[PDB]
Scaffold this active site. Sequence first.
Site, PDB file in Angstrom:
ATOM      1  N   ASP A  56       1.063  -1.243   0.052  1.00 43.01           N
ATOM      2  CA  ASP A  56       0.017  -0.021  -0.048  1.00 43.01           C
ATOM      3  C   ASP A  56       1.098   1.302  -0.119  1.00 43.01           C
ATOM      4  O   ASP A  56       1.458   1.647   0.999  1.00 43.01           O
ATOM      5  CB  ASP A  56      -0.829   0.101   1.136  1.00 43.01           C
ATOM      6  CG  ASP A  56      -1.951   0.906   1.193  1.00 43.01           C
ATOM      7  OD1 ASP A  56      -3.013   0.879   0.361  1.00 43.01           O
ATOM      8  OD2 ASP A  56      -1.845   2.036   1.788  1.00 43.01           O
ATOM      9  N   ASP A 116      -4.533   2.006  -4.688  1.00 43.18           N
ATOM     10  CA  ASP A 116      -3.824   2.097  -3.690  1.00 43.18           C
ATOM     11  C   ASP A 116      -2.304   1.348  -3.953  1.00 43.18           C
ATOM     12  O   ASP A 116      -1.329   1.760  -3.309  1.00 43.18           O
ATOM     13  CB  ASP A 116      -4.325   1.408  -2.615  1.00 43.18           C
ATOM     14  CG  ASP A 116      -5.490   2.401  -2.118  1.00 43.18           C
ATOM     15  OD1 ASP A 116      -6.219   2.492  -2.721  1.00 43.18           O
ATOM     16  OD2 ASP A 116      -5.410   2.818  -1.008  1.00 43.18           O
ATOM     17  N   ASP A 119      -0.463   1.130   7.297  1.00 45.12           N
ATOM     18  CA  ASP A 119      -1.706   0.632   6.394  1.00 45.12           C
ATOM     19  C   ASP A 119      -1.540  -0.697   5.848  1.00 45.12           C
ATOM     20  O   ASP A 119      -2.339  -1.583   5.864  1.00 45.12           O
ATOM     21  CB  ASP A 119      -2.066   1.543   5.154  1.00 45.12           C
ATOM     22  CG  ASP A 119      -2.657   2.884   5.575  1.00 45.12           C
ATOM     23  OD1 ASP A 119      -3.061   3.071   6.682  1.00 45.12           O
ATOM     24  OD2 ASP A 119      -2.418   3.830   4.694  1.00 45.12           O
ATOM     25  N   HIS A 144      -2.274   6.338   6.899  1.00 47.09           N
ATOM     26  CA  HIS A 144      -1.392   6.714   5.881  1.00 47.09           C
ATOM     27  C   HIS A 144       0.043   7.041   5.964  1.00 47.09           C
ATOM     28  O   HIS A 144       0.758   7.554   5.483  1.00 47.09           O
ATOM     29  CB  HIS A 144      -2.085   8.322   5.731  1.00 47.09           C
ATOM     30  CG  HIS A 144      -3.442   8.401   5.702  1.00 47.09           C
ATOM     31  ND1 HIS A 144      -4.350   8.001   4.473  1.00 47.09           N
ATOM     32  CD2 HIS A 144      -4.427   8.753   6.573  1.00 47.09           C
ATOM     33  CE1 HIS A 144      -5.522   8.027   5.102  1.00 47.09           C
ATOM     34  NE2 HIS A 144      -5.782   8.663   6.156  1.00 47.09           N
ATOM     35  N   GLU A 172       2.183   5.165  -0.244  1.00 49.06           N
ATOM     36  CA  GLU A 172       2.105   6.693  -0.147  1.00 49.06           C
ATOM     37  C   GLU A 172       2.515   7.413  -1.325  1.00 49.06           C
ATOM     38  O   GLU A 172       3.572   7.029  -1.778  1.00 49.06           O
ATOM     39  CB  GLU A 172       2.243   7.375   1.321  1.00 49.06           C
ATOM     40  CG  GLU A 172       1.800   6.484   2.555  1.00 49.06           C
ATOM     41  CD  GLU A 172       0.349   6.163   2.575  1.00 49.06           C
ATOM     42  OE1 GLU A 172      -0.351   7.291   2.212  1.00 49.06           O
ATOM     43  OE2 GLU A 172       0.046   5.154   3.022  1.00 49.06           O
TER      44      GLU A 172
HETATM   45  N1  LIG Z   1      -7.722  12.950   1.424  1.00 47.41           N
HETATM   46  C1  LIG Z   1      -6.902  13.071   0.408  1.00 47.41           C
HETATM   47  N2  LIG Z   1      -6.585  13.850  -0.251  1.00 47.41           N
HETATM   48  C2  LIG Z   1      -5.508  14.159  -1.275  1.00 47.41           C
HETATM   49  N3  LIG Z   1      -4.750  12.872  -1.519  1.00 47.41           N
HETATM   50  C3  LIG Z   1      -5.215  11.803  -0.722  1.00 47.41           C
HETATM   51  C4  LIG Z   1      -5.922  11.798   0.306  1.00 47.41           C
HETATM   52  N4  LIG Z   1      -6.243  10.671   0.871  1.00 47.41           N
HETATM   53  C5  LIG Z   1      -5.074   9.861   0.012  1.00 47.41           C
HETATM   54  N5  LIG Z   1      -4.608  10.580  -0.962  1.00 47.41           N
HETATM   55  C6  LIG Z   1      -3.610  10.242  -1.891  1.00 47.41           C
HETATM   56  O1  LIG Z   1      -3.487   8.714  -1.884  1.00 47.41           O
HETATM   57  C7  LIG Z   1      -2.194   8.258  -1.400  1.00 47.41           C
HETATM   58  C8  LIG Z   1      -2.671   7.003  -0.653  1.00 47.41           C
HETATM   59  O2  LIG Z   1      -3.821   6.912   0.074  1.00 47.41           O
HETATM   60  P1  LIG Z   1      -3.607   6.097   1.664  1.00 47.41           P
HETATM   61  O3  LIG Z   1      -3.267   4.717   1.243  1.00 47.41           O
HETATM   62  O4  LIG Z   1      -5.198   6.338   2.121  1.00 47.41           O
HETATM   63  O5  LIG Z   1      -2.607   6.899   2.414  1.00 47.41           O
HETATM   64  C9  LIG Z   1      -1.748   9.130  -0.434  1.00 47.41           C
HETATM   65  O6  LIG Z   1      -0.365   9.069   0.073  1.00 47.41           O
HETATM   66  C10 LIG Z   1      -2.165  10.556  -1.181  1.00 47.41           C
HETATM   67  O7  LIG Z   1      -1.130  10.794  -2.325  1.00 47.41           O
HETATM   68 MG   LIG Z   2      -3.592   2.771   0.533  1.00 50.51          MG
HETATM   69 MG   LIG Z   3      -1.930   4.053   2.796  1.00 49.27          MG
END
Ligand SMILES: Nc1ncnc2c1ncn2[C@@H]1O[C@H](COP(=O)(O)O)[C@@H](O)[C@H]1O
Ligand SMILES: [Mg+2]
Ligand SMILES: [Mg+2]
Length: 200
Positions: A12, A112, A176, A171, A14
């Site tokens: 997953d 993701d 995650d 995050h 970032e």
């Molecule tokens: N609320 C958000 N606003 C803008 N980008 C986001 C947001 N949530 C996730 N992302 C983007 O998506 C990536 C993966 O999301 P996550 O796995 O939920 O951390 C993050 O590292 C950001 O680049």
């Molecule tokens: Mg993710």
């Molecule tokens: Mg993540």
Amino acid sequence: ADSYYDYICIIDFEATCEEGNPPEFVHEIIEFPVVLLNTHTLEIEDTFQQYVRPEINTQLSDFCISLTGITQDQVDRADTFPQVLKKVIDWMKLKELGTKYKYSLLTDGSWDMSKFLNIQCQLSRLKYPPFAKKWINIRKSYGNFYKVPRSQTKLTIMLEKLGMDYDGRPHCGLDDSKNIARIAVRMLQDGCELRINEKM
Ligand SMILES: Nc1ncnc2c1ncn2[C@@H]1O[C@H](COP(=O)(O)O)[C@@H](O)[C@H]1O
Ligand SMILES: [Mg+2]
Ligand SMILES: [Mg+2]
């Protein structure tokens, strides 16, 4: 528990981002975690984690730093994406994945893992790795196995439904990935036959 694969690798990412998710901002991967789940013991046997230094948008937004907890200095000190992907491939080979052991990737959706990797491989002028061209999308697996709508397969909701709390910092890519792995463990314990269910 289903022993169809010897190992499942949870990835997953970032990525760089800006507040509001503007479509003109080009994403770069900034954290590359891999969680190695042994399907026989149901233990997280090992993990991989490296940050990645973005080159197109080198300065993380305040929003990105706040969201992910990854700091500017953490990416400043990191290797390039090609160098990190090389390390991941080495690590997987060390784990004998695809030779001694049968394995699958497992993700929290198409964005993701696959879409971020697809964008990044375009930017880095690298081939999209064949090993990442199919995966177990756990949102699809969970929705089909527990018979819940997509709205109820958000990461925190998947955990809550099963009587689990989120462990660590949301995050953070490694955290995650670990939480996704915990869900996969419970699905296997519950009798789910996790199978590849998404292709690029
Ligand atoms: N609320 C958000 N606003 C803008 N980008 C986001 C947001 N949530 C996730 N992302 C983007 O998506 C990536 C993966 O999301 P996550 O796995 O939920 O951390 C993050 O590292 C950001 O680049
Ligand atoms: Mg993710
Ligand atoms: Mg993540």
